[PDB]
Design an enzyme around this catalytic site. Structure first.
Site, PDB file in Angstrom:
ATOM      1  N   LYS A  98      -5.931  60.937 -28.241  1.00 25.59           N
ATOM      2  CA  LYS A  98      -4.795  61.068 -27.206  1.00 25.59           C
ATOM      3  C   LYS A  98      -4.933  62.221 -26.254  1.00 25.59           C
ATOM      4  O   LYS A  98      -4.495  63.277 -26.753  1.00 25.59           O
ATOM      5  CB  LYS A  98      -3.457  60.585 -27.706  1.00 25.59           C
ATOM      6  CG  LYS A  98      -2.560  60.459 -26.595  1.00 25.59           C
ATOM      7  CD  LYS A  98      -1.075  60.601 -26.947  1.00 25.59           C
ATOM      8  CE  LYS A  98      -0.113  60.621 -25.875  1.00 25.59           C
ATOM      9  NZ  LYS A  98       1.368  60.193 -25.894  1.00 25.59           N
ATOM     10  N   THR A 109       5.882  62.207 -29.112  1.00 25.90           N
ATOM     11  CA  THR A 109       6.711  62.933 -28.073  1.00 25.90           C
ATOM     12  C   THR A 109       8.004  61.800 -27.857  1.00 25.90           C
ATOM     13  O   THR A 109       9.319  62.140 -28.101  1.00 25.90           O
ATOM     14  CB  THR A 109       6.105  63.252 -26.793  1.00 25.90           C
ATOM     15  OG1 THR A 109       5.154  64.129 -27.039  1.00 25.90           O
ATOM     16  CG2 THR A 109       7.209  63.638 -25.654  1.00 25.90           C
ATOM     17  N   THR A 110       7.732  60.698 -27.396  1.00 24.83           N
ATOM     18  CA  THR A 110       8.530  59.695 -27.018  1.00 24.83           C
ATOM     19  C   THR A 110       9.695  59.254 -27.907  1.00 24.83           C
ATOM     20  O   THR A 110      10.565  59.266 -27.687  1.00 24.83           O
ATOM     21  CB  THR A 110       7.773  58.483 -26.488  1.00 24.83           C
ATOM     22  OG1 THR A 110       6.957  58.892 -25.256  1.00 24.83           O
ATOM     23  CG2 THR A 110       8.904  57.461 -25.859  1.00 24.83           C
ATOM     24  N   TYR A 158      -4.258  64.389 -31.222  1.00 24.22           N
ATOM     25  CA  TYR A 158      -3.175  64.320 -30.292  1.00 24.22           C
ATOM     26  C   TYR A 158      -3.121  65.657 -29.395  1.00 24.22           C
ATOM     27  O   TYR A 158      -2.352  66.597 -29.743  1.00 24.22           O
ATOM     28  CB  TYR A 158      -1.698  64.112 -30.821  1.00 24.22           C
ATOM     29  CG  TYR A 158      -0.405  63.905 -30.163  1.00 24.22           C
ATOM     30  CD1 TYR A 158      -0.591  63.996 -28.699  1.00 24.22           C
ATOM     31  CD2 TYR A 158       0.697  63.393 -30.550  1.00 24.22           C
ATOM     32  CE1 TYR A 158       0.604  63.688 -28.043  1.00 24.22           C
ATOM     33  CE2 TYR A 158       1.765  63.147 -29.941  1.00 24.22           C
ATOM     34  CZ  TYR A 158       1.770  63.324 -28.514  1.00 24.22           C
ATOM     35  OH  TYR A 158       2.847  63.085 -27.867  1.00 24.22           O
TER      36      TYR A 158
END
EC number: 4.1.2.55
Lengths: 293, 293, 293, 293
Positions: free
Chosen positions: C154, C42-43, C129
């Site tokens: 995660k 995402t980041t 994820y």
């Protein structure tokens, strides 16, 4: 389709039901075309009422009208059954109960048994008061059908798909929405009406929204509906439950005393501010000859 | 850190508080290492109790210990104030209140006045009972600071970030979780403990998990936490509020009478199946010398 | 326990990956104690990257370190399988995929088959994820166990109960939280670490929070954790995803170019305002000798 | 009011757009009374398509009709701008974009700049594709007014209050629902129609419901809506995205090739069971002379 007022309970300064203000209010509401009165609802602070107080409300409103749905539910099934039984000597439309609220993760089987229990002792039609925001859990069209003894439902879900499913699985059930904002839409889509808190202070608007839509004037229905939406939005700013007292005095002329703490009355600053946001709307409502100055 | 039991309220067959079975239970709970007793909570059907019954519960439990938190909230602020004042003659840890439940869209202003009023008349520390699932409304770390008079908070949110925020914004404040599944985690992350419904029926497990975590044997703590988790999950199959009675009997020997309808007691086959789900676990917990036969 | 950086992808002014800034960033992060780098998260605007761009990111970061988790997932299973296969010639920790996102109501069976498919072709360990805010649907501890081939997870759920259930049902699985706010808590409760976006710009804080807790200095851990929480909160004001570029330049000295539209760069007003809310926090972080002036 | 089909994208066995089967489908849909075609939506796996494929879809469908809404959004604003400009040489109803999906906590400021930029370069009316379930982010009636350049909105929220708010705050704006279950309701409450995935496989039903409601035969409309509802529900048992292929084949005769993994095609037993669920309904819809044998 109908408009049903979940009637406010006026209280005195020393925290008692002001029976006379309640009688004045109910008479006005019937006069302005409200079909039925839903007694001891959220808007009437039903949960804040003792069983004795729930009974006074019925008895006071019953002096005015027999067009009553008598909400008896609570977290003590024995009190609710007894109130249900007391209604035998009243000519009323029905009683009602919400699912036991507050309590998360009660078994469905226990929910079904709870409602079938009320049906077994009830001397009147039983209405499901499906209020999941307040209760947390939902009694959807399927659970309603499983219970099998509901004459109608008040669905406080705003997802109108959810509401329509009650008609679909229970073609014989009366199905009302709890939203002031779907009067136009409910009437036009073949549903049975709204249990609209805002009909406490603008009964004329809510009845007119319904009539316009059923006269197939859907575009006019929405223009008035959108005005009504704006009054509803204003009332939430300070607590819709408190503001409803101010707006009834303002639109309808008579006061309804105080609410019941912890529903505190709007202080004088809040009362001024609220009216400011509806001044224009009142004016307009006179402009259309919907309200009398 | 502590384990606090939201103590079950045992009822008779005719639906009154069974003071003798409450006292037995409270004695057992304190003997087995429970730190404090949270009275008139959800697990005890606090909201199904009249103000008088809420006081019965205080008085009965107070015969056994004074390590008590006294829940007094309700939908009549006058009733809560009356219980709050009456407590002055008991030497207890503090009083508590959930937010006015049921009612959505109460002003934040009005919610603060509710709690600050409660603080103004309270003779004991006032604890926040934050139960967003039952009330829908959240009293988060920010709002708890605005009220500014809370000695502690019980957070019935399972998102522990939200729980930690209470300690960040109110560093002097005691911050407990309401989750049985976060005992291991809560003790090791610097929070003040858990108000665990499951300590009604397995106080040995909850105290042991707590101690292992204090002792930084986290691996072992988690091994036991996860067995307790499996027990928590079993209790939900048939309704946790009713299963808590059956589980207190099975693990602890004594029975707790009846719940208060509409929390109906499990039937023989529901009870049958529930034990089958925790049979193995009772063994492993005995084998582990945590439970005596 | 570890701190894992979901590494930002720096872009040039003409919307290409700035490979060199990415290499500078990764080198700094490893130098300041970040254990592993989660690439194309995402980041890092993973969803905004072509498969070719996902590959450049790996290849550029791989010039700096072999401590890579290579996120390959997307809505075209064929692209993700091919990227998975390309990783064979890299010594890396693993690949990762989120559940297909955007799409609501995909069958669980199809979800399980999707993930087992990646496991079948993958030359490296596969990490789940689980990002339900982004995807909508959840792959909880039970579905993870059903898939049966995950080496780690995660979990971007903030409900730490949810995360712990992965350890409980998959005792052998590596389990990370995606929250910058649970570094202290995750370490103290026996979990494996955090995939923390904020370690991009304050790696020193996140590594130190972890070490303090594991040194059993839980109270110091939380005091620093709560400071870190405040930086995280600031970054959301304008879009955490944009602000992360500003805060890296500010805390770490080098810039990371621009983000990728529609992730627009903070204009000059927004950049000034953001720093104002962290000025004091920077100062304090120097005061504790955690950052170098 | 209109029915708009978010047209399925048929794929080959080797996972490229099947232009011949798309054209067949589009022709059929227009013949059966569909008003417009929404291209590259969820139902067509819009997000699984490259910018080039998104254009393939435009071009293929444009060989059949120009009554097209062209979805161009994605996580690279440059790609969407390029498709937007390229559309200038097609004479279509308009272009469309969902909000950047996946990314949570994008500034409202930045979201407005996304759409306003899209408007600045668009050669056609720009439609809002509001899909809060996929994106998590909401673009409500308020925000749609702030952007201020939307000719219309497709609202994939099932709470129709929220849908009506678009018409209240943007009275010139076209407001469609994305729900198959609100066709009857939408047409009768003064909204502009439905973008109904289910019109891929039962355009006769959706057009007929629409007409009955226009004709104020609401009772009949609802009778048919509820059968369609039962079909919508059946499609979800095995994954609606994959079932839409099977249902287009069964009701409409022609097949649509394959979906794009990870939307996997139903297997023979899933397909078997799906037909069993809609067998009776196909009959009643034939019997009703809505579907030919």
């Amino acid at each position: 389709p109908e408009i049903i007022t979940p009637i406010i309970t006026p209280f005195t300064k020393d925290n008692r039901i002001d029976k006379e203000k309640l009688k004045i209010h109910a008479e006005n509401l019937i006069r302005k075309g409200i079909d039925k009165l839903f007694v001891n609802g959220t808007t009437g602070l039903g949960p804040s009422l003792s069983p004795e107080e729930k009974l006074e409300n019925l008895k006071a409103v019953y002096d005015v009208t027999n067009k009553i749905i008598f909400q008896v539910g609570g977290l003590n099934l024995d009190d609710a059954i007894r109130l249900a039984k007391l209604s035998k000597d009243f000519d009323i439309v029905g009683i009602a109960s919400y699912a036991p609220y507050y309590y998360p993760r009660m078994s469905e089987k226990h929910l079904v048994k709870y409602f079938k229990t009320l049906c077994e002792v009830s001397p009147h039609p039983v209405y499901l008061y499906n209020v999941p925001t307040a209760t947390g859990k939902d009694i959807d069209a399927k659970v309603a059908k499983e219970i099998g003894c509901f004459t109608g439902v008040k669905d406080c879900i705003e997802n109108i798909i959810h509401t329509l499913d009650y008609k679909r699985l229970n073609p014989n059930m009366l199905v009302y929405s709890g939203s002031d904002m779907l009067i136009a839409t409910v009437a036009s889509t073949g549903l049975d009406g709204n249990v609209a808190a805002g009909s406490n202070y603008l009964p004329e608007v809510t009845v007119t929204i319904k009539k316009l839509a059923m006269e197939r004037k859907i575009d006019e229905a929405l223009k008035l509906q959108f005005l009504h939406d704006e009054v509803i939005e204003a009332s939430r700013i300070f607590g819709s439950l408190s503001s409803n007292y101010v707006l009834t005095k303002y639109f309808q002329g008579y006061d309804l005393g105080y609410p019941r703490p912890p529903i505190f009355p709007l202080d004088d600053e809040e009362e001024r501010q609220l009216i400011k946001k509806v001044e224009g709307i009142r004016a307009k409502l006179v402009e259309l000859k919907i309200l009398k100055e």
